[PDB]
Design a protein around this ligand. Structure first.
Ligand code: GDP
Ligand code: MG
Length: 179
């Protein structure tokens, strides 16, 4: 079996841990975990190709800026996340996440992921953003950002509804295998 390491980064609350936890065989309600603390492994076949992806979660706060790089050694693919209900989280993609990842993970492919796709048409989300004269991120904005940062691809998903989640991890596996 081919062994690859994946790291997920992005602002706190943008859905990183939930995205990884969709893959987990075992589930544990009413426990909030800042990061996946167990050795969670994704088993993905890509055209008769048994690949095991170790999934590494990260803490996005500024307080962890000096310890977060402990997660980066020997990474094979990055999931770089923002959330579609948070224009601020997209702004931090070029300003914080891209230079940090390119520095610690040189030449490692980046999948840019827009999380919480279910919230784009959600009435409450629309109202909360609208009161500050904001709106959910549009797909064209994610595509434009993937171009600016040189990402391998841009994909949208919802850990809540599960839409797009498979594609994220299958594309991350395809990315990890090119090197
Ligand atoms: N509506 C919706 N909420 C989500 C989704 N993913 C995560 N959440 C919620 O967003 C909050 C933060 O998620 P979490 O995975 O802990 O974010 P992290 O800080 O990036 O790890 C939690 O309350 C989740 O229930 C999603 O796809 N859709
Ligand atoms: Mg988390």
């Amino acid at each position: 079996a081919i062994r690859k390491k994946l790291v997920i980064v992005g602002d706190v609350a943008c859905g990183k841990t939930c995205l990884l936890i969709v893959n987990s065989k075992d589930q544990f309600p009413e426990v909030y975990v800042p990061t996946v603390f167990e050795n969670y492994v994704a088993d993905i076949e890509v055209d008769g190709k048994q690949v095991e992806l170790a999934l590494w979660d990260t803490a996005g706060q500024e307080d962890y800026d000096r310890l977060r790089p402990l997660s980066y050694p020997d990474t094979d693919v990055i999931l770089m996340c923002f959330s579609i209900d948070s224009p601020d989280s997209l702004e931090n993609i070029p300003e914080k996440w891209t230079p940090e990842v390119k520095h610690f993970c040189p030449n490692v492919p980046i999948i840019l992921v827009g999380n919480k796709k279910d919230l784009r048409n959600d009435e409450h989300t629309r109202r909360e953003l609208a009161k500050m004269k904001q709106e959910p991120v549009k797909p064209e904005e994610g595509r434009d950002m993937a171009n600016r940062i040189g990402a391998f691809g841009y994909m949208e998903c919802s850990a809540k509804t599960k839409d797009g989640v498979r594609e994220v991890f299958e594309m991350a596996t395809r990315a990890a295998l090119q090197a």
